Design a protein around this ligand. Structure first.
Ligand SMILES: [Cl-]
Ligand SMILES: [Cl-]
Ligand SMILES: [Cl-]
Ligand SMILES: [Cl-]
Ligand SMILES: [Cl-]
Ligand SMILES: [Cl-]
Ligand SMILES: [Cl-]
Ligand SMILES: [Cl-]
Ligand SMILES: [Cl-]
Ligand SMILES: [Cl-]
Ligand SMILES: [Cl-]
Ligand SMILES: [Cl-]
Ligand SMILES: [Cl-]
Ligand SMILES: [Cl-]
Ligand SMILES: [Cl-]
Ligand SMILES: [Cl-]
Ligand SMILES: [Cl-]
Ligand SMILES: [Cl-]
Ligand SMILES: [Cl-]
Ligand SMILES: [Cl-]
Ligand SMILES: [Cl-]
Ligand SMILES: [Cl-]
Ligand SMILES: [Cl-]
Ligand SMILES: [Cl-]
Lengths: 221, 221, 221, 221, 221, 221
């Protein structure tokens, strides 16, 4: 990675053994549960493309998912090239060549070139660009690998309201719909698919009640 | 996070793998027991909003609680906006834009903007503001998820006084009443809800006896 | 905490995850055995009041003991205020306000104020003052939670002398009597409460024999 | 290893105990699965030849594989010598001798000479040269130790398409054919060796469908 | 401890949690086996008296041994005072007071005074003086707690010579006789107390054979 | 140890708890398997003689081997003295005394003297000299403690060729013959002591076939 050291300057160092192991274990334990994605982001903080590739390549198994991720990365890289066409010419002293998509994904660039772009003035944050592309691919996999739909989450007749809400928001997190759609699902389905007793009590609260108030309302039900 | 390095200057670095893992395990093991909140605060020391979001987003399950936390954060952010209305105008050289609530919660600000505010002169401690909002939400969850009321904690006839006091103060810690109310509960209920034998001995001590003296008094009872 | 960094200057940093976890496990495993207190001191080296509060607040359970500790801290803080009455007036540029007891215990002071006092010229070692108060409270708890009295430690007829000495000095360590009283207990009781055979052999050594000599003397008995 | 320290300068330090142990455990657990190679690369970041030899020599067992690796290293070293014949003459002040293959592999060079080459202007990246040779040998071993051929991976009649794809791309990763050949295997065999029902559905998608689309298509089959 | 930092200057820091835990576990696992003493020395490298006291005070149980250690420390401290009598007078600016034995053992000196002595010009290595005294006491305990005498180590009739030598040198290590006495034990007893067959073969080697030669000689016996 | 810090200067620090523990566990688990020696070297990187003695002295048990190691160290030290006779005279300002063998082995030198030699201009690498002597002794022990001879490694009639090669090269690694002798063993015995079927197939390859080719040849046999 690259980190702001104890002077304010930015410097390169290798990924720590513990970071590597943490990432490998996360994938082994949690597979593609939604919380894996922010764990990926945290563990890859300040990463170069080489560092990000290291993390992805250290995964054994799940090679359908890793292949899907590769294809998503290829799509993003091709899009980058279209928007940012590389201009032919000899690179001047004290200047970096313009990165292609494959340079951003770390397949046709060296570590020094990556370091060159990331610490340039102005910086070309190639690590953060690639990480954006990776996270897009991870989101696609999390959706793909989710078993349930939000339309199927229904409160059981003896089910504590808190457990139903836990299942509701777990499933919602895996859905790849925008925030406005997620707001509608919260506004519409949560109360609609609650059990008869709770549902009546929540209808009586009326529009605009908080989740806290809803959970306190259906607590002894 | 951001920490005072070995010169006196403040510098950014990523959240350590061990910090991340410590937080995830704390939540897995202890759920929303009161001691989780100071553990959160300790692990999030010097955190940026991005770091704080990382910690919250790495939790799998408990999504009813995490949704309640989000709503509490939205309420605080809306309150901040009301008190601190952003003034329209082009931002001058060597100046930061005024943060909205969503900038403080790390959803509409970048890491560099967050770093910009936190290390400014004078500093806008956006990490500590957001952490205050998070802890408010955590306190609400701890209350919500507490099984027992302080009014129900009664000493059993053969129960050692020390075990009753342990149960009393555990339950008291989860209550979300102010210090003056907590003082009244200590002054009123502890002796009132003790068992007949101990209760008589503690009445005989009179007003203003210490807990130590009370525990020594009822020791062989 | 605060530590003398690699230049000689003192700088603030957060409590390490491992420190926090070490402290939590110590309390879980050993409860209030005497060795917990030096472990507390070691783990809290260079701590600010905020750091010390973090350590105490991260304990779940044992809330009778933690309440007793709070009360002891209140007593010490009230004593400090009596000895050090705060003088009213506007604080000058390049000067710190005088700390009250509650500032020392970290309840009415900020982290920056704490850092202000601890690194001042001359320093007001607020961390070490508070730690002294905490350790007083811990000593009271260790005494309270000790099962046995030193007067009851008697060597069994077939008990190896070394095992009796182990029990003797374990129990002695939990007693809250001064060194001169502890010297008298060693001088008087150890030989007095030994078993008939050993006791005769130790009487024959006479006054002023070392523990080593006593243990070698009763070895094959 | 050697790493860009907190000034921008490069400095030597020993391999960490955790790095060593991580490498030993990786080999113990995963043997020569493909993901071992990027784990090797990550753990050996900034390594000197002495460091790389340490990692290889710490492996107990697998000595057929380690012997094959030695022979591959000898072949590469002999090739280097042919391309880079060492010119006889006394080495001038402020100059390094030209490295032979055995100097690159760390068998006839000292640590200081290795450090001399790696930090020279221009640098002779002897660590990265040797690592390239090692990885060539590791790739040969991974191929050798792979049980299955990509031509034998066929979807079972009741096998979920996702599990077949996992097996397909696991086996493909162990094959030592170029990217163009791997593209042909993906284009040709994946659909060809799918089960009758899925195979018909994938033929209907037509040329140029993505893996994601293929996996969504055969999901309920 | 105190360590030569990255400039050449010496600086104070607290004992690491891992150091503390390592020491506590060593004592729990190995009790007072001879190898505990060099482990103590290693873990206490650059320690102040306060640090050394921390390590000793964190031991729970073994309080007979810890009391013996205290008494040995008192004897050494009294000897120091006799050799180094403190001269009465007001301490000058830029000068340290002369340490008594109790200052060296860390019971009547502060951390800053300890740091004062250890970093003085010329240094008064109070940490290393105290550690010498501690190790003397540990050696006494290891002897005390050794079950066997070197005179009783005799090779069994079917016992491999290598196992007998292991037992011989284990027991020898616990003996508190000087090197010249230990040389005589090696020269005299090892061959003398070997079994009839081996003993004859070793007599035939004659005076001045190495241990290696002796072990190769009796290998198939 | 001593390491090139973040300025280029060399500085002393104590052996890390994890290094110590890693070494102790290595010896406990793997005894004197050949891979222990490079693990020793790695863990002792930049070590002073005091550090190297710490590592050897922390081993409990195996005292026959540790005694053999001591004797080998005495032989090397006596050889050093013969080659480097110490010249009598008062040591000048800004000069180090000439080290004897016992100074190199860390038994008659102080830590500061060791540091004096290792950081001198030109340096006297006393740590690396002693480590060479230790490794000589370790090699002798590994040979001594090897059960099998390379002449006895014969392929079983149903034994996969890869497993035979693993056993062959494991045993070869423990032999203390030079590289030219090891080359002859590879050239002569491997094919000679293979099973009838494989042996015929390997004879047909002819002189100069690689191990890889040999292993591919006998794969389905
Ligand atoms: Cl996996
Ligand atoms: Cl990689
Ligand atoms: Cl790969
Ligand atoms: Cl660009
Ligand atoms: Cl959880
Ligand atoms: Cl996040
Ligand atoms: Cl998220
Ligand atoms: Cl503001
Ligand atoms: Cl607890
Ligand atoms: Cl707190
Ligand atoms: Cl709290
Ligand atoms: Cl004051
Ligand atoms: Cl292995
Ligand atoms: Cl090696
Ligand atoms: Cl080796
Ligand atoms: Cl070259
Ligand atoms: Cl213990
Ligand atoms: Cl202490
Ligand atoms: Cl103590
Ligand atoms: Cl003195
Ligand atoms: Cl061992
Ligand atoms: Cl030692
Ligand atoms: Cl020793
Ligand atoms: Cl010399």
């Amino acid at each position: 990675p690259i980190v702001q050291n104890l002077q304010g300057q930015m410097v390169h160092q290798a990924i720590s053994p513990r970071t590597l192991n943490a990432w490998v274990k996360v994938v082994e334990e949690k597979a593609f549960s939604p919380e894996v994605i922010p764990m990926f982001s945290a563990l890859s903080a300040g990463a170069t493309p080489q560092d990000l590739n290291t993390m992805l390549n250290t995964v054994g198994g799940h090679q359908a998912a890793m292949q899907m991720l590769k294809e998503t990365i290829n799509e993003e890289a091709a899009e980058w090239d279209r928007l940012h066409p590389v201009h032919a010419g000899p690179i001047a002293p004290g200047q970096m060549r313009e990165p292609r998509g494959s340079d951003i994904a770390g397949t046709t660039s060296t570590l020094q070139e990556q370091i060159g772009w990331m610490t340039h003035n102005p910086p070309i944050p190639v690590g953060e660009i690639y990480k954006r592309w990776i996270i897009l691919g991870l989101n696609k996999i999390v959706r793909m690998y989710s078993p349930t739909s939000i339309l199927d989450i229904r409160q059981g007749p003896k089910e504590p309201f808190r457990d139903y809400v836990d299942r509701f928001y777990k499933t919602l997190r895996a859905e790849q719909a925008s925030q406005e759609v997620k707001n509608w699902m919260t506004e519409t389905l949560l109360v609609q698919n609650a059990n008869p007793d709770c549902k009546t009590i929540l209808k009586a609260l009326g529009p605009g009640a908080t989740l806290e108030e809803m959970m306190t309302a259906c607590q002894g039900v």
